[PDB]
Design a protein around this ligand. Sequence first.
Ligand SMILES: Nc1ncnc2c1ncn2[C@@H]1O[C@H](COP(=O)(O)OP(=O)(O)O)[C@@H](O)[C@H]1O
Ligand SMILES: [Mg+2]
Lengths: 177, 66, 456, 109
Amino acid sequence: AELTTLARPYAKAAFEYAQAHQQLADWSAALGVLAAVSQDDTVRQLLKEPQLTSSAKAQSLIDVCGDKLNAPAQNFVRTVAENKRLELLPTIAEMYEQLKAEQEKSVEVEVTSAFTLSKEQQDKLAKALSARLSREVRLHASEDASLIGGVIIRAGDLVIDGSVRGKLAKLAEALKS
Amino acid sequence: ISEIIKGRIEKLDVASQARNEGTIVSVSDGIVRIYGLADVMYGEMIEFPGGVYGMALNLEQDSVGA
Amino acid sequence: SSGRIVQIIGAVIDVEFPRDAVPSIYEALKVQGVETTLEVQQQLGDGVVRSIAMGSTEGLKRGLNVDSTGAAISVPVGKATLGRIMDVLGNPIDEAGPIGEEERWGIHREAPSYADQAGGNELLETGIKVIDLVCPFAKGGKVGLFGGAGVGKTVNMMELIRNIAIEHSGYSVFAGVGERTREGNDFYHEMKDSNVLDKVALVYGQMNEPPGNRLRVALTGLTMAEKFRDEGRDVLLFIDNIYRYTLAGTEVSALLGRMPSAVGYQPTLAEEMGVLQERITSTKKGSITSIQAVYVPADDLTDPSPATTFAHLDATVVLSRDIASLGIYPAVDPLDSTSRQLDPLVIGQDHYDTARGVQYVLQRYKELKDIIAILGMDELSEADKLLVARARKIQRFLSQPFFVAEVFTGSPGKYVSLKDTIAGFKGILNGDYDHLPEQAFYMVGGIEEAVEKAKK
Amino acid sequence: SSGRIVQIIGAVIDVEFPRDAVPSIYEALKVQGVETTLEVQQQLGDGVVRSIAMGSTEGLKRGLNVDSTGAAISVPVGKATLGRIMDVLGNPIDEAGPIGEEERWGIHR
Ligand SMILES: Nc1ncnc2c1ncn2[C@@H]1O[C@H](COP(=O)(O)OP(=O)(O)O)[C@@H](O)[C@H]1O
Ligand SMILES: [Mg+2]
């Protein structure tokens, strides 16, 4: 099944807990650190051995993170290890932020301009994008030299394109049909 | 991440294994599952303790069915 | 970029590539070190592709680097392929060194459009009485030799090749798909000794080869025939067994993650068959005349594979195990065999009336057979007694000794023109030869011979 | 050593043992509180073995202790078995007292 399907119970559990105890920022750091540690080639190799018990694998991971995990996070790590799901930690870390973002009423947009970048330009659109989405917007601008002239705005599944490449595509299908 | 988290890892004493060796995981109805035989070729012969020999048939992603 | 083998299970291999360098569907891959080719069949996701080996996997290991070729299997095409024996990858499998190709085509292609189809009814004479009568073939038409195991599919095809290909002025492609290696050797020496090997391209994928080889051999042979058709030429395409293409898909389907359908077949049986069969056609540039042998599992014509094949052919010739079990060859079933050219507006009323006349007599006798078993012959009416005699003779007069079967029959081969085929059956139906014993029509070529055999 | 019943499904029972004390295939095991006998069929990994009960499983529960006997089901053999009725484990079922066995043989050969 999709890693997302397998990570949905664990992530919702972390979030309902962080929310009822006011820890929505502490768990973000803890899950990001746990996800990070598990991906390392030495730790990846260790977690895939038949010699270690579930408790031994769980313990070894809490020891590397240490203070980064509060009492509750370490216990969550023990639950994930007991169920043999330590390969889903990057996915579990990702879905937690999504539930949190819908709670905080915010979005991480991913703007891509052709050849220009200005502090005035980012806010000019963050007002309309915020107004449209009804959420606070954490723009993440970047560079896309591929485009002749314009910008491509991605937020969630919505993609507001105002790039000349987009107008080229339209003009081209229109002319060949 | 943090240099401290970067450490502890070089002090975990993570073992290693040759590409021509592995260990038995389960034993059922004449089928044995083995971990770690990275250089196994399909149809190759595997040597177990006691002079028992096996033949590698399932070279799956994380287990060898012999 | 470069990929690593991650999972080998039988003939199916998974290869993982950078998520920005995932090879296309049907793309060919090459293993480093080992001489093995893999064709991408599915993109599982996360840079991994599922592929089938075009060779053996006994030497393959997990972690071997795989290279992306950027295209599908490209085989040599044109004049350089004539008089040569080749494998699925187009490599020469004869000791005559390399082939001087001037172009390579990809085995995968679209079928000709609806506006490119062409219609023709030029009658093609075969020299066999049963076929020339009830299954008249047409130039540029599709023929199918349906039958079980041991009833004559290869023998009949060889006789046609001899009575058509040898005289045919144009080129020819012979594809041995899931065939016995002994038949391929006998046919190669036969084309070579007959001096006809110069105008025949030979592609062989026998039963000793991996599923992937038997799954693409038909596309290789067809790709060579399509190059010749597109040059404006008239071509002959002979396929030894097209069932082996369906079976190779059944053998690999479950390992590809597909749920099984009825009679344990791949769920893509009708589309995989349509994608191949729609390319074997005569367009407005050139004409491909094709003869395919169709294996019938357990002699059951209702099995999904044979049942899905009938709709793709113009002429359907049916071989019966019950006729072969009586020492009768060719064992064609006149009441089950059919042809589109069987129409008075295409051939003529005299031919059509003779064919329907023979069928009427044999259909009525199929019901009196059981009546004669219980009770006896005496209890029948005179018209039934008289009909039973002609039916048993017509059944025997359908038998013709073939030159390719002399090794088995022991007698010399015979060739009967459609005129003699029509004349003889018309006379027997008229009752002119009611004075001849039943044993005189068995393996006697023309009716004249039957009159002579009655004296021996 | 001693294992714990971890799973029960009809006549089949899964038992977990320490990694250095896992019973071999066909080894006989006895449940501590009922003395029910189990025969090991396969080793599943992580110290877990799968077994078939040589009696009724009604009343058994998860967490019960299990003892490994170090040998396969061994039954009495020879002249002492003549004129006697026995069950699958070699116990007498004819009310005529114990069997005067001189030796026992394993049932797998
Ligand atoms: N016309 C025929 N005359 C004599 N023998 C024949 C004829 N057709 C088939 N046979 C017999 O059957 C075999 C060849 O038929 P074949 O083409 O191999 O059948 P199929 O391809 O349907 O399995 C030989 O053993 C041969 O004796
Ligand atoms: Mg044959």
